Design a protein around this ligand. Sequence first.
Ligand SMILES: Cc1cc2c(cc1C)N(C[C@H](O)[C@H](O)[C@H](O)COP(=O)(O)OP(=O)(O)OC[C@H]1O[C@@H](n3cnc4c(N)ncnc43)[C@H](O)[C@@H]1O)c1[nH]c(=O)[nH]c(=O)c1N2
Ligand SMILES: CCCCCCCCCCCCCCCCCC(=O)O[C@@H](COC(=O)CCCCCCCCCCCCCCC)COP(=O)(O)OC[C@H](O)CO
Length: 452
Amino acid sequence: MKELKYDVLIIGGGFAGSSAAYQLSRRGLKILLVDSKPWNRIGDKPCGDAVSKAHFDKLGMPYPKGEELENKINGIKLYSPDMQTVWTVNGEGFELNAPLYNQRVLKEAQDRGVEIWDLTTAMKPIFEDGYVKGAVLFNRRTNEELTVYSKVVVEATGYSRSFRSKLPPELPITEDLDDKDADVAYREVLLTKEDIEDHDYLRIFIDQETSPGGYWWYFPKGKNKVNVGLGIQGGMGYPSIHEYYKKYLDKYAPDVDKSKLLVKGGALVPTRRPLYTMAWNGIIVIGDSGFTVNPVHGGGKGSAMISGYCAAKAILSAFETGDFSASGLWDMNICYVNEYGAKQASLDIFRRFLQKLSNDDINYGMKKKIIKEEDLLEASEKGDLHLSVADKAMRVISGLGRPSLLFKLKAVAESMKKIKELYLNYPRSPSSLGSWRREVDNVLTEFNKSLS
Ligand SMILES: Cc1cc2c(cc1C)N(C[C@H](O)[C@H](O)[C@H](O)COP(=O)(O)OP(=O)(O)OC[C@H]1O[C@@H](n3cnc4c(N)ncnc43)[C@H](O)[C@@H]1O)c1[nH]c(=O)[nH]c(=O)c1N2
Ligand SMILES: CCCCCCCCCCCCCCCCCC(=O)O[C@@H](COC(=O)CCCCCCCCCCCCCCC)COP(=O)(O)OC[C@H](O)CO
Protein backbone atom coordinates (compact mmCIF):
# COMPACT_ATOMS: atom_id res chain seq x y z
CA MET A 1 0.00 0.00 0.00
CA LYS A 2 1.13 3.56 -0.82
CA GLU A 3 2.62 5.45 2.13
CA LEU A 4 2.84 9.24 2.47
CA LYS A 5 4.50 11.47 5.10
CA TYR A 6 2.67 14.51 6.48
CA ASP A 7 3.20 16.76 9.47
CA VAL A 8 -0.49 16.90 10.42
CA LEU A 9 -3.55 14.91 9.32
CA ILE A 10 -6.95 16.49 10.01
CA ILE A 11 -9.85 14.07 9.88
CA GLY A 12 -13.08 15.92 9.18
CA GLY A 13 -13.69 19.28 7.56
CA GLY A 14 -16.65 20.79 9.41
CA PHE A 15 -16.28 23.93 11.50
CA ALA A 16 -13.83 22.17 13.81
CA GLY A 17 -11.53 20.62 11.21
CA SER A 18 -11.69 23.57 8.85
CA SER A 19 -10.78 25.94 11.71
CA ALA A 20 -7.77 23.81 12.57
CA ALA A 21 -6.70 23.76 8.91
CA TYR A 22 -7.11 27.52 8.54
CA GLN A 23 -5.26 28.31 11.78
CA LEU A 24 -2.35 26.00 10.85
CA SER A 25 -1.99 27.38 7.32
CA ARG A 26 0.72 29.69 5.92
CA ARG A 27 3.26 28.18 8.31
CA GLY A 28 5.27 25.83 6.09
CA LEU A 29 3.76 22.65 7.53
CA LYS A 30 2.67 19.78 5.29
CA ILE A 31 -0.98 19.31 6.20
CA LEU A 32 -3.65 17.01 4.82
CA LEU A 33 -7.34 17.32 5.62
CA VAL A 34 -9.79 14.62 4.59
CA ASP A 35 -13.56 14.45 4.67
CA SER A 36 -15.88 11.58 3.70
CA LYS A 37 -18.27 14.02 1.99
CA PRO A 38 -17.87 15.36 -1.53
CA TRP A 39 -16.66 18.96 -1.62
CA ASN A 40 -20.04 20.57 -2.31
CA ARG A 41 -21.61 18.88 0.71
CA ILE A 42 -18.88 19.58 3.24
CA GLY A 43 -20.37 21.53 6.12
CA ASP A 44 -23.98 20.46 5.52
CA LYS A 45 -24.71 18.62 8.77
CA PRO A 46 -28.14 19.73 10.08
CA CYS A 47 -27.76 22.87 12.21
CA GLY A 48 -29.68 25.98 13.22
CA ASP A 49 -26.79 27.89 11.58
CA ALA A 50 -26.64 30.60 14.25
CA VAL A 51 -23.21 31.75 15.46
CA SER A 52 -22.08 34.69 17.62
CA LYS A 53 -20.04 37.41 15.90
CA ALA A 54 -17.71 37.46 18.92
CA HIS A 55 -16.21 34.09 17.97
CA PHE A 56 -15.07 35.39 14.60
CA ASP A 57 -13.81 38.57 16.27
CA LYS A 58 -11.73 36.73 18.88
CA LEU A 59 -10.25 33.96 16.71
CA GLY A 60 -9.43 35.78 13.50
CA MET A 61 -11.63 33.48 11.47
CA PRO A 62 -12.77 34.81 8.08
CA TYR A 63 -15.84 37.00 8.30
CA PRO A 64 -18.95 35.54 6.59
CA LYS A 65 -19.90 37.48 3.44
CA GLY A 66 -22.19 37.42 0.41
CA GLU A 67 -24.41 34.36 0.04
CA GLU A 68 -22.66 33.08 3.22
CA LEU A 69 -24.36 35.59 5.50
CA GLU A 70 -28.08 35.00 5.21
CA ASN A 71 -29.28 37.23 8.04
CA LYS A 72 -27.80 39.53 10.68
CA ILE A 73 -28.80 38.66 14.26
CA ASN A 74 -29.17 41.23 17.04
CA GLY A 75 -30.46 39.01 19.83
CA ILE A 76 -32.66 36.19 21.07
CA LYS A 77 -36.25 36.10 22.30
CA LEU A 78 -36.70 33.31 24.85
CA TYR A 79 -40.30 32.15 25.37
CA SER A 80 -41.84 30.51 28.43
CA PRO A 81 -43.86 27.30 27.86
CA ASP A 82 -47.13 29.26 28.13
CA MET A 83 -45.68 31.95 25.83
CA GLN A 84 -46.80 34.59 28.31
CA THR A 85 -43.26 35.64 29.21
CA VAL A 86 -40.55 36.50 26.68
CA TRP A 87 -37.02 37.32 27.82
CA THR A 88 -34.90 39.34 25.41
CA VAL A 89 -31.13 38.97 25.37
CA ASN A 90 -29.18 41.17 22.96
CA GLY A 91 -26.03 40.10 21.14
CA GLU A 92 -24.62 40.25 17.62
CA GLY A 93 -24.41 37.16 15.45
CA PHE A 94 -24.90 35.62 12.05
CA GLU A 95 -27.38 33.28 10.47
CA LEU A 96 -25.02 31.54 8.06
CA ASN A 97 -25.15 29.44 4.96
CA ALA A 98 -23.02 26.86 6.75
CA PRO A 99 -21.84 24.74 3.81
CA LEU A 100 -20.96 27.86 1.79
CA TYR A 101 -18.95 29.44 4.60
CA ASN A 102 -17.33 26.15 5.64
CA GLN A 103 -16.29 25.44 2.05
CA ARG A 104 -14.82 28.93 1.67
CA VAL A 105 -12.73 28.46 4.82
CA LEU A 106 -11.47 25.17 3.38
CA LYS A 107 -10.73 26.64 -0.05
CA GLU A 108 -8.76 29.46 1.56
CA ALA A 109 -6.84 27.00 3.75
CA GLN A 110 -6.11 25.10 0.53
CA ASP A 111 -4.88 28.27 -1.21
CA ARG A 112 -2.74 28.78 1.90
CA GLY A 113 -1.04 25.42 1.55
CA VAL A 114 -3.33 22.79 3.11
CA GLU A 115 -4.00 19.71 0.98
CA ILE A 116 -7.63 18.53 0.95
CA TRP A 117 -9.04 15.19 -0.19
CA ASP A 118 -12.83 14.97 -0.33
CA LEU A 119 -14.81 11.72 -0.55
CA THR A 120 -12.02 10.30 1.61
CA THR A 121 -12.59 8.40 4.84
CA ALA A 122 -10.06 7.68 7.56
CA MET A 123 -10.82 4.00 8.06
CA LYS A 124 -8.48 3.09 10.88
CA PRO A 125 -5.72 4.53 13.05
CA ILE A 126 -2.08 3.69 12.70
CA PHE A 127 -1.25 3.05 16.35
CA GLU A 128 2.18 1.87 17.40
CA ASP A 129 4.26 2.00 20.58
CA GLY A 130 1.48 3.90 22.36
CA TYR A 131 1.21 6.65 19.75
CA VAL A 132 -1.22 7.57 17.05
CA LYS A 133 1.03 7.78 14.00
CA GLY A 134 -1.45 8.47 11.20
CA ALA A 135 -4.30 6.70 9.43
CA VAL A 136 -5.26 4.31 6.68
CA LEU A 137 -7.44 6.26 4.26
CA PHE A 138 -9.83 5.21 1.55
CA ASN A 139 -10.07 7.85 -1.16
CA ARG A 140 -13.26 7.22 -3.14
CA ARG A 141 -12.38 9.83 -5.77
CA THR A 142 -9.25 7.99 -6.87
CA ASN A 143 -10.42 4.60 -5.58
CA GLU A 144 -7.20 4.12 -3.58
CA GLU A 145 -6.37 2.94 -0.09
CA LEU A 146 -3.48 5.01 1.28
CA THR A 147 -1.43 5.05 4.45
CA VAL A 148 -0.70 8.54 5.71
CA TYR A 149 1.83 9.05 8.49
CA SER A 150 1.60 12.16 10.64
CA LYS A 151 3.13 13.57 13.81
CA VAL A 152 -0.35 14.61 15.00
CA VAL A 153 -3.84 13.56 13.96
CA VAL A 154 -6.57 16.14 14.57
CA GLU A 155 -9.74 14.13 15.17
CA ALA A 156 -12.57 16.35 13.97
CA THR A 157 -15.09 13.68 12.95
CA GLY A 158 -18.06 15.22 14.76
CA TYR A 159 -20.48 13.12 16.79
CA SER A 160 -19.45 10.05 14.78
CA ARG A 161 -16.13 9.96 16.70
CA SER A 162 -15.27 7.54 13.96
CA PHE A 163 -11.49 7.51 14.34
CA ARG A 164 -10.82 7.83 18.07
CA SER A 165 -13.44 5.17 18.84
CA LYS A 166 -11.16 2.69 17.05
CA LEU A 167 -8.24 3.23 19.41
CA PRO A 168 -7.56 0.93 22.41
CA PRO A 169 -10.41 1.40 24.91
CA GLU A 170 -8.11 1.88 27.92
CA LEU A 171 -6.89 5.23 26.52
CA PRO A 172 -8.62 8.35 27.87
CA ILE A 173 -8.89 9.72 24.34
CA THR A 174 -11.52 7.03 23.60
CA GLU A 175 -13.96 8.38 26.25
CA ASP A 176 -17.62 7.82 25.31
CA LEU A 177 -20.66 9.71 26.58
CA ASP A 178 -23.85 8.83 28.37
CA ASP A 179 -26.96 8.76 26.17
CA LYS A 180 -28.50 11.42 28.43
CA ASP A 181 -25.54 13.75 27.70
CA ALA A 182 -26.69 14.47 24.14
CA ASP A 183 -29.80 15.65 22.37
CA VAL A 184 -31.20 14.54 19.06
CA ALA A 185 -32.15 17.61 17.05
CA TYR A 186 -34.01 18.11 13.77
CA ARG A 187 -34.71 21.13 11.60
CA GLU A 188 -36.18 22.34 8.33
CA VAL A 189 -35.65 25.53 6.37
CA LEU A 190 -38.91 26.88 4.97
CA LEU A 191 -40.26 29.98 3.24
CA THR A 192 -42.94 31.94 5.13
CA LYS A 193 -46.26 33.37 3.90
CA GLU A 194 -46.08 36.45 6.11
CA ASP A 195 -43.13 38.76 6.84
CA ILE A 196 -41.20 37.64 9.87
CA GLU A 197 -41.66 39.97 12.85
CA ASP A 198 -38.36 41.19 14.31
CA HIS A 199 -36.47 39.03 11.85
CA ASP A 200 -33.15 40.07 13.41
CA TYR A 201 -34.07 38.10 16.54
CA LEU A 202 -33.81 34.34 16.99
CA ARG A 203 -36.68 32.68 18.85
CA ILE A 204 -36.18 29.92 21.39
CA PHE A 205 -39.24 28.24 22.92
CA ILE A 206 -38.84 26.34 26.16
CA ASP A 207 -41.39 23.55 26.60
CA GLN A 208 -40.90 20.23 28.38
CA GLU A 209 -43.96 18.70 26.69
CA THR A 210 -43.18 19.59 23.08
CA SER A 211 -39.36 19.40 23.30
CA PRO A 212 -38.47 17.49 26.47
CA GLY A 213 -34.94 18.21 27.60
CA GLY A 214 -34.26 20.67 24.79
CA TYR A 215 -36.25 23.40 23.10
CA TRP A 216 -37.96 24.49 19.90
CA TRP A 217 -36.48 27.25 17.79
CA TYR A 218 -37.36 29.63 14.98
CA PHE A 219 -34.19 31.21 13.55
CA PRO A 220 -34.95 33.69 10.73
CA LYS A 221 -32.67 33.49 7.69
CA GLY A 222 -34.34 36.50 6.06
CA LYS A 223 -37.64 38.37 6.04
CA ASN A 224 -39.44 35.34 4.60
CA LYS A 225 -37.24 32.33 5.34
CA VAL A 226 -36.71 30.45 8.59
CA ASN A 227 -34.71 27.60 10.11
CA VAL A 228 -37.20 25.94 12.48
CA GLY A 229 -36.47 22.91 14.63
CA LEU A 230 -36.22 21.24 18.00
CA GLY A 231 -33.90 19.25 20.21
CA ILE A 232 -34.90 16.60 22.75
CA GLN A 233 -32.78 14.81 25.35
CA GLY A 234 -31.48 11.37 24.45
CA GLY A 235 -31.50 8.29 26.68
CA MET A 236 -35.03 8.97 27.96
CA GLY A 237 -37.12 6.71 25.71
CA TYR A 238 -38.88 9.60 23.95
CA PRO A 239 -40.73 8.89 20.67
CA SER A 240 -39.40 9.86 17.25
CA ILE A 241 -38.22 13.46 17.00
CA HIS A 242 -39.77 13.52 13.51
CA GLU A 243 -43.12 12.88 15.18
CA TYR A 244 -42.64 15.68 17.73
CA TYR A 245 -41.77 17.99 14.84
CA LYS A 246 -44.86 17.09 12.81
CA LYS A 247 -47.15 17.34 15.83
CA TYR A 248 -46.04 20.72 17.17
CA LEU A 249 -44.67 22.65 14.16
CA ASP A 250 -47.86 24.75 13.86
CA LYS A 251 -47.45 26.00 17.44
CA TYR A 252 -44.08 27.56 16.64
CA ALA A 253 -44.26 28.22 12.90
CA PRO A 254 -47.89 28.78 11.88
CA ASP A 255 -46.59 31.01 9.07
CA VAL A 256 -44.45 28.56 7.09
CA ASP A 257 -45.29 27.28 3.64
CA LYS A 258 -44.95 23.51 4.01
CA SER A 259 -44.81 23.17 0.22
CA LYS A 260 -41.67 25.34 0.01
CA LEU A 261 -39.02 23.47 1.93
CA LEU A 262 -35.32 24.16 1.18
CA VAL A 263 -33.66 21.60 3.48
CA LYS A 264 -34.54 19.05 6.17
CA GLY A 265 -32.65 16.75 8.50
CA GLY A 266 -31.46 15.89 11.97
CA ALA A 267 -28.40 14.75 13.89
CA LEU A 268 -27.10 14.24 17.41
CA VAL A 269 -25.50 16.99 19.47
CA PRO A 270 -23.47 16.44 22.65
CA THR A 271 -24.52 18.53 25.66
CA ARG A 272 -21.82 18.07 28.30
CA ARG A 273 -18.38 19.09 29.57
CA PRO A 274 -15.62 18.41 27.02
CA LEU A 275 -13.62 15.19 26.74
CA TYR A 276 -11.67 14.94 30.00
CA THR A 277 -8.57 15.10 27.84
CA MET A 278 -8.64 16.36 24.26
CA ALA A 279 -4.97 15.36 23.82
CA TRP A 280 -3.04 12.11 23.86
CA ASN A 281 0.09 10.69 22.21
CA GLY A 282 0.01 11.81 18.58
CA ILE A 283 -3.61 13.01 18.64
CA ILE A 284 -5.85 15.96 19.47
CA VAL A 285 -9.66 15.79 19.42
CA ILE A 286 -11.82 18.81 18.57
CA GLY A 287 -15.42 19.84 17.88
CA ASP A 288 -18.37 17.55 18.54
CA SER A 289 -15.97 14.58 18.67
CA GLY A 290 -14.44 16.23 21.74
CA PHE A 291 -17.84 17.33 23.11
CA THR A 292 -17.22 21.08 22.66
CA VAL A 293 -20.89 22.12 22.56
CA ASN A 294 -22.42 24.56 25.07
CA PRO A 295 -24.53 22.31 27.34
CA VAL A 296 -27.27 24.87 28.03
CA HIS A 297 -27.98 26.31 24.60
CA GLY A 298 -26.59 23.59 22.33
CA GLY A 299 -24.44 25.96 20.27
CA GLY A 300 -21.28 24.27 19.04
CA LYS A 301 -20.02 26.00 15.90
CA GLY A 302 -18.34 28.79 17.87
CA SER A 303 -16.79 26.42 20.38
CA ALA A 304 -15.76 24.12 17.50
CA MET A 305 -13.78 27.06 16.11
CA ILE A 306 -12.27 27.73 19.54
CA SER A 307 -11.18 24.10 19.71
CA GLY A 308 -9.55 24.37 16.26
CA TYR A 309 -7.71 27.49 17.41
CA CYS A 310 -6.44 25.69 20.53
CA ALA A 311 -5.44 22.65 18.51
CA ALA A 312 -3.41 24.76 16.11
CA LYS A 313 -1.67 26.48 19.03
CA ALA A 314 -0.80 23.19 20.73
CA ILE A 315 0.47 21.66 17.50
CA LEU A 316 2.72 24.62 16.73
CA SER A 317 4.21 24.29 20.22
CA ALA A 318 4.75 20.55 19.75
CA PHE A 319 6.70 21.20 16.54
CA GLU A 320 8.95 23.53 18.57
CA THR A 321 9.71 20.94 21.24
CA GLY A 322 9.54 17.87 19.03
CA ASP A 323 7.30 16.36 21.73
CA PHE A 324 4.06 14.86 20.36
CA SER A 325 3.23 12.91 23.51
CA ALA A 326 0.17 13.70 25.58
CA SER A 327 2.37 16.02 27.65
CA GLY A 328 3.73 17.63 24.50
CA LEU A 329 0.21 18.36 23.27
CA TRP A 330 -1.27 19.11 26.72
CA ASP A 331 -1.57 22.84 26.01
CA MET A 332 -4.60 21.86 23.95
CA ASN A 333 -6.39 21.13 27.22
CA ILE A 334 -5.09 24.19 29.04
CA CYS A 335 -6.07 26.53 26.19
CA TYR A 336 -9.49 24.99 25.61
CA VAL A 337 -10.48 24.80 29.28
CA ASN A 338 -9.47 28.45 29.73
CA GLU A 339 -11.30 29.64 26.61
CA TYR A 340 -14.53 27.63 26.91
CA GLY A 341 -14.26 24.26 28.68
CA ALA A 342 -14.46 25.43 32.30
CA LYS A 343 -17.61 27.35 31.45
CA GLN A 344 -18.96 24.24 29.73
CA ALA A 345 -18.43 22.19 32.86
CA SER A 346 -20.41 24.68 34.96
CA LEU A 347 -23.16 24.67 32.34
CA ASP A 348 -23.22 20.84 32.32
CA ILE A 349 -24.47 21.12 35.94
CA PHE A 350 -26.91 23.91 35.11
CA ARG A 351 -28.35 21.97 32.15
CA ARG A 352 -29.17 18.98 34.36
CA PHE A 353 -31.17 21.24 36.63
CA LEU A 354 -33.02 22.96 33.77
CA GLN A 355 -33.89 19.62 32.14
CA LYS A 356 -35.65 18.50 35.36
CA LEU A 357 -37.87 21.60 35.69
CA SER A 358 -41.56 21.37 34.88
CA ASN A 359 -43.40 23.70 32.53
CA ASP A 360 -45.11 25.16 35.62
CA ASP A 361 -41.67 25.82 37.15
CA ILE A 362 -40.39 27.59 34.05
CA ASN A 363 -43.58 29.62 33.55
CA TYR A 364 -43.49 30.73 37.19
CA GLY A 365 -39.77 31.50 37.29
CA MET A 366 -39.88 33.51 34.07
CA LYS A 367 -43.06 35.41 34.94
CA LYS A 368 -41.81 36.26 38.44
CA LYS A 369 -38.38 37.28 37.10
CA ILE A 370 -36.55 34.72 39.25
CA ILE A 371 -33.37 36.03 37.63
CA LYS A 372 -32.77 38.94 35.26
CA GLU A 373 -32.27 38.53 31.51
CA GLU A 374 -28.72 39.76 32.09
CA ASP A 375 -28.23 37.05 34.73
CA LEU A 376 -29.18 34.36 32.23
CA LEU A 377 -26.65 35.82 29.78
CA GLU A 378 -23.96 35.79 32.48
CA ALA A 379 -24.66 32.08 33.06
CA SER A 380 -24.64 31.31 29.31
CA GLU A 381 -21.50 33.30 28.54
CA LYS A 382 -19.35 32.90 31.66
CA GLY A 383 -20.91 29.86 33.32
CA ASP A 384 -21.42 31.85 36.50
CA LEU A 385 -24.48 31.88 38.69
CA HIS A 386 -23.45 34.12 41.56
CA LEU A 387 -24.56 32.99 45.02
CA SER A 388 -25.99 36.50 45.42
CA VAL A 389 -28.28 36.24 42.37
CA ALA A 390 -29.29 32.84 43.69
CA ASP A 391 -30.28 34.42 47.02
CA LYS A 392 -32.46 37.00 45.27
CA ALA A 393 -34.06 34.22 43.23
CA MET A 394 -34.93 32.31 46.40
CA ARG A 395 -36.60 35.37 47.86
CA VAL A 396 -38.55 35.83 44.61
CA ILE A 397 -40.06 32.34 44.74
CA SER A 398 -40.52 32.25 48.51
CA GLY A 399 -44.28 32.55 48.10
CA LEU A 400 -44.59 29.47 45.87
CA GLY A 401 -47.03 27.08 47.52
CA ARG A 402 -46.20 23.71 45.99
CA PRO A 403 -43.20 21.39 45.85
CA SER A 404 -40.67 22.55 43.27
CA LEU A 405 -37.14 21.84 42.12
CA LEU A 406 -36.76 25.62 41.81
CA PHE A 407 -35.89 25.73 45.52
CA LYS A 408 -32.64 23.88 44.77
CA LEU A 409 -31.25 26.78 42.76
CA LYS A 410 -28.85 27.86 45.50
CA ALA A 411 -27.36 24.37 45.69
CA VAL A 412 -27.14 24.31 41.89
CA ALA A 413 -25.13 27.55 41.99
CA GLU A 414 -22.84 26.00 44.61
CA SER A 415 -22.22 22.92 42.47
CA MET A 416 -21.56 25.13 39.43
CA LYS A 417 -18.96 27.14 41.32
CA LYS A 418 -17.38 23.92 42.62
CA ILE A 419 -17.02 22.30 39.20
CA LYS A 420 -15.79 25.58 37.67
CA GLU A 421 -13.05 25.72 40.31
CA LEU A 422 -12.04 22.12 39.56
CA TYR A 423 -11.70 23.09 35.90
CA LEU A 424 -9.73 26.24 36.75
CA ASN A 425 -7.37 23.77 38.43
CA TYR A 426 -7.18 21.47 35.40
CA PRO A 427 -4.24 18.99 35.73
CA ARG A 428 -0.97 20.48 34.49
CA SER A 429 0.22 17.09 33.25
CA PRO A 430 -1.29 13.71 32.21
CA SER A 431 -0.07 12.07 35.42
CA SER A 432 -2.77 13.95 37.36
CA LEU A 433 -5.66 13.34 34.95
CA GLY A 434 -7.07 10.30 36.73
CA SER A 435 -7.37 11.74 40.22
CA TRP A 436 -8.82 14.98 38.83
CA ARG A 437 -11.33 13.11 36.65
CA ARG A 438 -12.51 11.14 39.68
CA GLU A 439 -13.08 14.40 41.56
CA VAL A 440 -15.19 15.75 38.70
CA ASP A 441 -17.14 12.49 38.41
CA ASN A 442 -17.86 12.62 42.14
CA VAL A 443 -19.23 16.17 41.90
CA LEU A 444 -21.52 15.06 39.07
CA THR A 445 -22.64 11.86 40.84
CA GLU A 446 -23.52 13.80 44.00
CA PHE A 447 -25.28 16.48 41.99
CA ASN A 448 -27.39 13.97 40.05
CA LYS A 449 -28.46 12.40 43.33
CA SER A 450 -29.49 15.80 44.68
CA LEU A 451 -32.07 16.22 41.91
CA SER A 452 -33.53 12.71 42.12
C1 LIG B 1 -30.11 20.24 14.42
C2 LIG B 1 -28.94 20.91 15.09
C3 LIG B 1 -28.98 22.28 15.32
C4 LIG B 1 -27.88 22.96 15.83
C5 LIG B 1 -26.70 22.24 16.13
C6 LIG B 1 -26.68 20.87 15.93
C7 LIG B 1 -27.78 20.19 15.41
C8 LIG B 1 -27.68 18.71 15.09
N1 LIG B 1 -25.59 22.97 16.62
C9 LIG B 1 -24.31 22.30 16.92
C10 LIG B 1 -23.33 22.44 15.73
O1 LIG B 1 -23.99 22.16 14.50
C11 LIG B 1 -22.16 21.47 15.89
O2 LIG B 1 -21.66 21.58 17.22
C12 LIG B 1 -20.97 21.72 14.96
O3 LIG B 1 -21.39 21.89 13.60
C13 LIG B 1 -19.95 20.61 15.05
O4 LIG B 1 -18.90 20.82 14.09
P1 LIG B 1 -17.79 19.70 13.87
O5 LIG B 1 -16.86 20.22 12.85
O6 LIG B 1 -17.21 19.22 15.19
O7 LIG B 1 -18.60 18.43 13.31
P2 LIG B 1 -19.36 18.12 11.92
O8 LIG B 1 -20.24 16.97 12.19
O9 LIG B 1 -20.00 19.39 11.36
O10 LIG B 1 -18.22 17.68 10.91
C14 LIG B 1 -17.59 16.39 11.03
C15 LIG B 1 -17.04 16.03 9.68
O11 LIG B 1 -16.23 14.84 9.79
C16 LIG B 1 -16.41 14.06 8.63
N2 LIG B 1 -15.99 12.71 8.97
C17 LIG B 1 -16.48 11.93 9.99
N3 LIG B 1 -15.85 10.78 10.12
C18 LIG B 1 -14.88 10.82 9.13
C19 LIG B 1 -13.85 9.93 8.78
N4 LIG B 1 -13.58 8.80 9.44
N5 LIG B 1 -13.02 10.30 7.78
C20 LIG B 1 -13.25 11.45 7.14
N6 LIG B 1 -14.16 12.38 7.41
C21 LIG B 1 -14.93 12.02 8.44
C22 LIG B 1 -17.87 14.26 8.26
O12 LIG B 1 -18.11 13.98 6.89
C23 LIG B 1 -18.09 15.75 8.60
O13 LIG B 1 -17.94 16.64 7.50
C24 LIG B 1 -25.59 24.34 16.53
N7 LIG B 1 -24.42 25.01 16.79
C25 LIG B 1 -24.38 26.38 16.67
O14 LIG B 1 -23.36 27.01 16.91
N8 LIG B 1 -25.52 27.00 16.23
C26 LIG B 1 -26.75 26.42 16.00
O15 LIG B 1 -27.65 27.08 15.48
C27 LIG B 1 -26.76 25.02 16.20
N9 LIG B 1 -27.91 24.33 15.97
C1 LIG C 1 -31.45 22.21 27.61
C2 LIG C 1 -30.14 21.54 27.23
C3 LIG C 1 -30.22 21.07 25.79
C4 LIG C 1 -30.56 22.24 24.89
C5 LIG C 1 -30.04 22.01 23.49
C6 LIG C 1 -31.19 21.67 22.56
C7 LIG C 1 -30.62 21.27 21.22
C8 LIG C 1 -30.00 22.50 20.61
C9 LIG C 1 -30.01 22.41 19.10
C10 LIG C 1 -30.07 23.82 18.57
C11 LIG C 1 -28.90 24.61 19.10
C12 LIG C 1 -29.07 26.06 18.70
C13 LIG C 1 -27.84 26.81 19.14
C14 LIG C 1 -28.08 28.30 19.08
C15 LIG C 1 -26.80 29.02 19.48
C16 LIG C 1 -27.05 30.49 19.76
C17 LIG C 1 -25.89 31.33 19.28
C18 LIG C 1 -24.73 31.33 20.27
O1 LIG C 1 -23.62 31.03 19.85
O2 LIG C 1 -24.90 31.66 21.64
C19 LIG C 1 -24.52 32.97 22.03
C20 LIG C 1 -25.14 33.35 23.37
O3 LIG C 1 -26.54 33.45 23.33
C21 LIG C 1 -27.15 33.06 24.54
O4 LIG C 1 -26.69 33.44 25.59
C22 LIG C 1 -28.37 32.16 24.52
C23 LIG C 1 -29.11 32.25 25.83
C24 LIG C 1 -30.31 31.31 25.78
C25 LIG C 1 -29.98 30.00 26.47
C26 LIG C 1 -31.21 29.13 26.55
C27 LIG C 1 -31.38 28.65 27.97
C28 LIG C 1 -32.75 28.04 28.16
C29 LIG C 1 -33.02 27.85 29.64
C30 LIG C 1 -33.24 29.18 30.33
C31 LIG C 1 -34.61 29.20 30.99
C32 LIG C 1 -34.58 30.05 32.24
C33 LIG C 1 -35.68 29.57 33.17
C34 LIG C 1 -35.51 30.20 34.54
C35 LIG C 1 -35.49 29.12 35.60
C36 LIG C 1 -34.25 29.27 36.45
C37 LIG C 1 -23.03 33.12 22.27
O5 LIG C 1 -22.20 32.09 21.78
P1 LIG C 1 -21.36 31.24 22.82
O6 LIG C 1 -22.30 31.00 23.98
O7 LIG C 1 -20.89 29.92 22.24
O8 LIG C 1 -20.08 32.02 23.36
C38 LIG C 1 -19.89 33.41 23.19
C39 LIG C 1 -18.66 33.89 23.92
O9 LIG C 1 -17.78 34.49 22.99
C40 LIG C 1 -17.98 32.72 24.59
O10 LIG C 1 -16.78 32.38 23.93
